[PDB]
Symmetry: none
Subunit: 110 residues, 2 copies
């Protein structure tokens, strides 16, 4: 609950860029090797990612603050419509998960 | 029959990839294969005869907590400076065991700006 994923949909288009919004809550200090992964549900460790992007250190970070971030994942790194469920996970520089979103599928929407 | 036997299946393989951006290659180990530290995935021009014909390659990392008979998802990132540029040729991924045998191959693709 230390990193909250925001406005997470139930599905995302497979071949378009995805915009991942999240909040660095007061309960965590970011670190420049932190990253966000797209993980298939049922994952055990942080090495089980499908794709990832570095979460860039917030400019002029003041401790204990509340910061909202955006990451655009490119469509050609996203899964296809494979019926599987994926989620977002925030991973720190060491490898602890401190954020995990509701699941979602890549496919056309309702 | 067909070749190679599909002991490794490449997943979500696109029709084309960016010439100068890294690509992320996804494959699954089937219950037929027991992976080995010297297995690798190569990018091969279509029409390859043996594992010697590769364009570029990476070692396939040995999966953690490996249990025989399992289906295992893997991913490799090939750097763009090791990828073919827009040469009009067709390529595929192939999984090659340490015994030097091709045990999986993907659908073909070329390196160019996407449609």
């Amino acid at each position: 609950a230390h990193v909250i994923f925001q406005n997470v949909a139930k599905s995302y288009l497979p071949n378009a860029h995805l915009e991942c919004h999240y909040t660095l809550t007061p309960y965590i200090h970011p670190h420049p090797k932190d990253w966000v992964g797209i993980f298939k549900v049922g994952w055990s460790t942080a090495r089980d990612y499908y794709t990832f992007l570095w979460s860039p250190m917030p400019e002029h970070y003041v401790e204990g603050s509340t910061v909202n971030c955006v990451l655009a994942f490119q469509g050609y790194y996203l899964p296809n419509d494979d019926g599987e469920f994926y989620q977002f996970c925030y991973v720190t520089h060491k490898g602890e998960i401190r954020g995990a979103s509701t699941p979602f599928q890549f496919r056309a929407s309702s």
